[PDB]
């Protein structure tokens, strides 16, 4: 078995909905990256890549690589998973912690787990997603952005 | 085996001692929200539940449900642990990282480990608890709150 | 197998370079502690000690004790690893997440991996190091300090 950790942060900016764990949530602010800014999926991708000793999202999808520029986070996840599986890895389980003061993540989590399990080719039970606030403290608590932590266990 | 990740934050507020890992530690301020404010045990709870894909502490014990209203974090842990064991899981080991500038945790950690080991029905050697400051940086470093990280490895 | 989690933050201060994963990186600022301030190696050390249930880089090396005074983080890592192996543990794998806006960690990562692999006496494929920004948010995003998350898996 192999352990991986991922951490990601995206700042608010613009309007439109945000996308967390592949799920569109309505919010007064959008998430500025060039990513879609799926904090949950990027942190998960890093947790998975890190468990496979394949580096991170940046190493696999560099700015000077036209293939995945403008691709959504799920596409990046599936590709990362593809290269992880090519190395001989199977999915143990994943656990994702969304750190956000707002919006409320809870009702949207079931569909995140569905989306993640589809992309990783696994069951509901292998994917856990949870949310928490920083009790109005820090940059997350001041509503400046959303953080996310993810761990992943892989089998070879 | 299965991994989970817990992360909790509680702001400083009021008087009395703080409760960390079941241990009441003398401090100038208390810890606020809901239950006794045990960031250590809530994060530990979330990590264990996250490993069992049972969501989080807030999912088992919602705001609305009066059943768990007024219960301390050790009671919440033992109940969460009961739900986890009812799913067929046993404990591999746990690691808790208390993120606080003060107060000093180090004298109280041996006692934290004892309480946790009893609540999870495991050996002391299966329980690790540690502390780190953020070197006066962030909300923890400014003494605004205590963060807590936790990881758990379950067996099935 | 046993899980471990490490976390560390160090504030910027003085002149460069900074040392991250045993690698001196040119930067406008340095890192304050009376260590070399290696957040990566301290978080890794804590992750490993945590997995072994040996406490932390503080219980093992007291600030009061002048025995390990002036020691660099690689020496502390190797000593921690010696004591961990003395408990009968070997290395599964490690994953390290440097949380920093700057400097760019990417061209120094392979070196960190090599140093960590030599210090832990393991294969390079057993060591993963990654870096992430906080999108200019928090103390890391403002260039006040550097955080690091680490996870370890040990075998007995
Ligand atoms: N101190 C640092 C911080 C980061 N890095 C490298 O830059 C890369 C990008 O850093 P980031 O800004 O923290 O991560 P990212 O989420 O990529 O932020 C940019 C917006 O997101 C993306 O555009 C994106 C997301 C997933 C995959 C590819 C992407 N380009 C990291 O993956 C890492 O390899 C580095 O070398 N040194
Ligand atoms: N962005 C977010 C942030 C949080 N949440 C949900 O709200 C819950 C509480 O969020 P929090 O405000 O960050 O947690 P905290 O105050 O630390 O409280 C822990 C939750 O446990 C309880 O609610 C509880 C504890 C003891 C007795 C009764 C309780 N209801 C989370 O567990 C999560 O399910 C969410 O859905 N989206
Ligand atoms: N709330 C807390 C926070 C930390 N601690 C203990 O302090 C120790 C150190 O915590 P820290 O100060 O946050 O981490 P560290 O990176 O070790 O601090 C700076 C390192 O530079 C040094 O000062 C140093 C390091 C090694 C040997 C001598 C040194 N002077 C922890 O391992 C823990 O045992 C604690 O008991 N309670
Ligand atoms: C999500 C993680 C890894 C939390 C632990 C690190 C920490 C205590 C950051 C402080 O918050 P902050 O940087 O938001 O404080 P501020 O922005 O107020 O300086
Ligand atoms: Zn991202
Ligand atoms: Zn809590
Ligand atoms: Zn340190």
CATH number at residue C11: 3.30.1330.50
Q: For residues C109 and C125, what is the distance between their CA atoms, to the nearest angstrom?
A: 13
- How many Cβ atoms from other residues are within 10 Å of residue B155's Cβ? 13
* β-sheet bridge partners, residue A151: A5, A95
Q: For residues B47 and B5, what is the distance between their CA atoms, to the nearest angstrom?
A: 4
A137 and B32: CB-CB below 8 Å?
no
For chain C, the domain total comes to 1
Query: For residues B95 and B150, is the Cβ–Cβ distance under 8 A?
Result: yes
Query: Which ligand 2 atom is at minimum distance from the Cα of A101?
Result: 1
Q: For residues C13 and C145, what is the distance between their CA atoms, to the nearest angstrom?
A: 9
C102 a known binding residue?
yes
Query: For residues B18 and B10, is the Cβ–Cβ distance under 8 A?
Result: no
Q: What is the CA(C135)–ligand 7 centre distance, in A?
A: 23
Resolution (A): 2.3
Q: For residues B123 and B121, what is the distance between their CA atoms, to the nearest angstrom?
A: 7
**Closest among C119, C73, C120 to C93, alpha carbons compared:** C120
B55 and A133: CB-CB below 8 Å?
no
Dihedral of alpha carbons A10, C139, C6, A130, sign: negative
Query: For residues C131 and A56, is the Cβ–Cβ distance under 8 A?
Result: yes
Q: For residues B111 and A29, what is the distance between their CA atoms, to the nearest angstrom?
A: 45
As a residue count, chain B comes to: 156
Question: What residues in A contact C136, CB-CB < 8 Å?
Answer: 11
Range of the domain at B41: 1-156
Sole residue written with tokens 């967390």:
A20
Query: Rg (Cα) of chain A, in Å, rounded?
Result: 15
Query: For residues B82 and B142, is the Cβ–Cβ distance under 8 A?
Result: no
Sole residue written with tokens 């986070």:
A73
- Residues of B within an 8 Å Cβ radius of C: 1, 3, 92-95, 97, 99, 106, 109, 124-128, 130-138, 141, 149-153
Provide φ and ψ at C10, rounded to 5°.
Answer: -135, 140
Query: For residues A49 and A60, is the Cβ–Cβ distance under 8 A?
Result: yes
Question: Which runs of E-coded beta strand occur in chain C?
Answer: 2-13, 18-20, 23-25, 30-31, 90-99, 127-132, 145-155
Smallest CA–CA distance, residue A47 to chain B, in Å, is 12
Sole residue written with tokens 């986890």:
B84
Distances (CA, A) of A146 to A1, A10, B32, C59: 30, 6, 23, 34
CA angle, A92 as apex, A86 and A96 as ends, to 5°? 105
For residue B2, give both structure tokens: 């299965």
Query: For residues A155 and A122, is the Cβ–Cβ distance under 8 A?
Result: no
Question: Which runs of E-coded beta strand occur in chain B?
Answer: 2-11, 18-20, 23-25, 90-99, 127-132, 145-155
Mutate to test the interface with A, among B63, B139, B153 (most CBs of A within 10 A): B139
B59 and A128: CB-CB below 8 Å?
no
Q: Determination technique for this PDB entry?
A: X-ray
Q: What is the CA(A38)–ligand 5 centre distance, in A?
A: 6
Query: For residues C130 and C22, is the Cβ–Cβ distance under 8 A?
Result: no
- Residues of C within an 8 Å Cβ radius of B: 1-11, 32-33, 46-47, 49-56, 58-59, 138-139, 144-145, 147, 149, 151
For residue C31, give both structure tokens: 């890192």
Query: For residues A78 and A40, is the Cβ–Cβ distance under 8 A?
Result: no
Task: Chain B: list its partners (3+ Cβ pairs within 8 Å).
Answer: A, C
For residue A52, give both structure tokens: 């496979």
Sole residue written with tokens 């264990």:
B48
- How many Cβ atoms from other residues are within 10 Å of residue B83's Cβ? 15
Whether the bond into A119 is cis, omega within 30 of 0: no
Find, in chain B, the residue whose alpha carbon is nearest to that of A137. B139
Q: For residues B106 and B21, what is the distance between their CA atoms, to the nearest angstrom?
A: 12
Question: Which runs of E-coded beta strand occur in A13-126?
Answer: 18-20, 23-25, 31-32, 90-99
Query: For residues A5 and A153, is the Cβ–Cβ distance under 8 A?
Result: no
**Closest among C119, A113, C57 to B59, alpha carbons compared:** A113
Find, in chain C, the residue whose alpha carbon is nearest to that of B107. C59
Question: What residues in B contact C48, CB-CB < 8 Å?
Answer: none
Query: For residues A96 and A132, is the Cβ–Cβ distance under 8 A?
Result: no
CA angle, A61 as apex, A55 and A63 as ends, to 5°? 120
For residue B35, give both structure tokens: 């239950």
Q: For residues B4 and B44, what is the distance between their CA atoms, to the nearest angstrom?
A: 9
Provide φ and ψ at A52, rounded to 5°.
Answer: -90, 0
Q: For residues C24 and A4, what is the distance between their CA atoms, to the nearest angstrom?
A: 25
Provide φ and ψ at A9, rounded to 5°.
Answer: -140, 135
């Amino acid at each position: 078995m192999r352990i991986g950790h991922g951490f990601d942060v995206h700042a608010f900016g613009g309007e439109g909905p945000i996308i967390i764990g592949g799920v569109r949530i309505p919010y007064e602010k959008g998430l500025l990256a060039h990513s879609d800014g799926d904090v949950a999926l990027h942190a998960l991708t890093d947790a998975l890549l890190g468990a496979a000793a394949l580096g991170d999202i940046g190493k696999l999808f560099p700015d000077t690589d036209p293939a995945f520029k403008g691709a959504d986070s799920r596409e990046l996840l599936r590709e990362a998973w593809r290269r992880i599986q090519a190395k001989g890895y199977t999915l143990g389980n994943v656990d994702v912690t969304i750190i956000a003061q707002a919006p409320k993540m809870l009702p949207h989590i079931p569909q995140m787990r569905v989306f993640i399990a589809e992309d990783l080719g696994c069951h509901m039970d292998d994917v856990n997603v949870k949310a928490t606030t920083t009790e109005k403290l820090g940059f997350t608590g001041r509503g400046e952005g959303i953080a996310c932590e993810a761990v992943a266990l892989l089998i070879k």
